[model samples]
Target: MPNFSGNWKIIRSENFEELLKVLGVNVMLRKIAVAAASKPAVEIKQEGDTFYIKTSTTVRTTEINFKVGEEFEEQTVDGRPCKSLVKWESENKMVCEQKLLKGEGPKTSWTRELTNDGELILTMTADDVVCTRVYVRE
Candidate 1:
């Protein structure tokens, strides 16, 4: 289980929409995501190999349950027409591989990590370019 218990806020975001665009997310969906700029504060608790993650915002709440190094289907809260697979990358890192049913690619993966300086980094890839976003704990 990863140590992911804190109040995280988005300080910066880059190419996050590109990944979403590649996943065939419509403009309305994107707009909702951007309007909900209040970054979801995540609360994570782990027991043995299973993990429970809760992402809560003013508009909606999302939860994820999975085991380390395991993969499971994830649905977008903003009604995007795609599903994703979340995988453990390391102790403080995880990967999200999204599969777009209506897009050009079969998979798009993003890495989320917590830095030593208490920063959250999100790296997303569409085809070649890796777009990065940074966050801070509040």
Candidate 2:
């Protein structure tokens, strides 16, 4: 397994626009997010097949705890109520299923992994399908 235990700073972010777009973030919010020099930070720790990821930013903070091939409920970065399931697609790839609240539009999840090139890759989606954006972490 990948050693995802450490404090990771946002060196760069890609596909944030697409993530914001799918999340219904307006232009102003997107602009603010893009213009800000500091992006979200994550502290990840793993114990066996279970891991905990804490993500924090100026706008919001969130914590996620799950094991490979397990399901759980997770709140969005902005506190949107949702439920999700995670499954390991490969040694380094994990996928999630996000169920949104009523009237909250579509529910989506994402697959995240660390690439050999030393980049964190994220793939967002809805209804168990894949979306267009693939976020890369700097």
Candidate 3:
């Protein structure tokens, strides 16, 4: 279950739209990100010890290239500077953490796992709002 390299597509989510709305994420970008929240099609490729992720929709697109547990600079669609990191918690769990570099908002976290039944689970928490998004292999 540690292997998570491949293309994935989102099939559904819980409280995702509401979470974005609460965070004050721009409506248009949220719609696009949510729409593409792999609503569906996120590419995850791992090489050596690093991973590359790409997300896109009709209105917005974003990419992430990183090594496990390594910190990197990132910014939200709304232009919030962030320091992001993703690390393996176990063979069945990988956790993503994001710290706002400068903002009045709280930090963000995402706990991800791939189920035995091949379901992709992504649970995220930010600013006291939590959402779960499920994806399937494409």
Candidate 4:
């Protein structure tokens, strides 16, 4: 399993706005979300197959705890209620699937990858839109 136990800071993002738009976030909230995501930070700790993830941004802070391949309930920062499942795809890659519990929308997916150069890459997808963010170890 990948040792994702550390702090990370965002350095770059691509098509983030489109991702939020597809998720049906309100215009006003999306503006704030986009700005907050500009320099977001994340912390992760792994204990065997269980993982703890915390995300901090200018306007919001969120945390999640889950075991690999197990499903859990989640409330998204954008105020969506969903059931989420996380799994490891490789030693340095992990993916999450989120199914909305009370809404009509595509199932969201998040893919986290650690590059050979030790950078964290996050890819979020909703419907056909994809947002990618790159982060460096903090």
Output the number of the TM-score-best candidate: 4
Over the stretch 1-138, how does candidate 1's per-residue lDDT look in tens digits? 225555567788676666666656699877776556446676666675576777676776777777756656555433435556667778778887766556455245667787888787867676675668777766
Number of clashes found in candidate 3:
0
Off by over 4 Å in 1: 47-49, 76-88, 98-106, 128-131
Sorted on TM-score, best first, the list reads: 4, 3, 2, 1
TM-score of 3: 0.82
lDDT string for model 2 (1-138, tens) is 446566776654556566656677689877776555246677788887798988776766778899877768886533477877888788777778777664575567777787786656666664333433222333
Give the lowest summed-lDDT range of ten residues in model 2: 129-138
106: Cα error in model 2, Å: 2.9
Model 1 per-residue lDDT at 82: 54
TM-score of every candidate: 0.67, 0.75, 0.82, 0.91
lDDT of 4 by residue, 23-131 (tens): 7888998999998888877998888879888988878888988998989987654667889988888978898888888868866888888899888898989888889
For model 3, residues 21-51, the per-residue Cα lDDT tens digits are 7778778867776665545567888775687
* Whole-model Cα lDDT of every candidate shown, in order: 0.66, 0.66, 0.75, 0.84
Q: Tally clashes: model 4.
A: 0
In model 2, the runs with Cα more than 4 Å from the true position are 35-38, 126-138
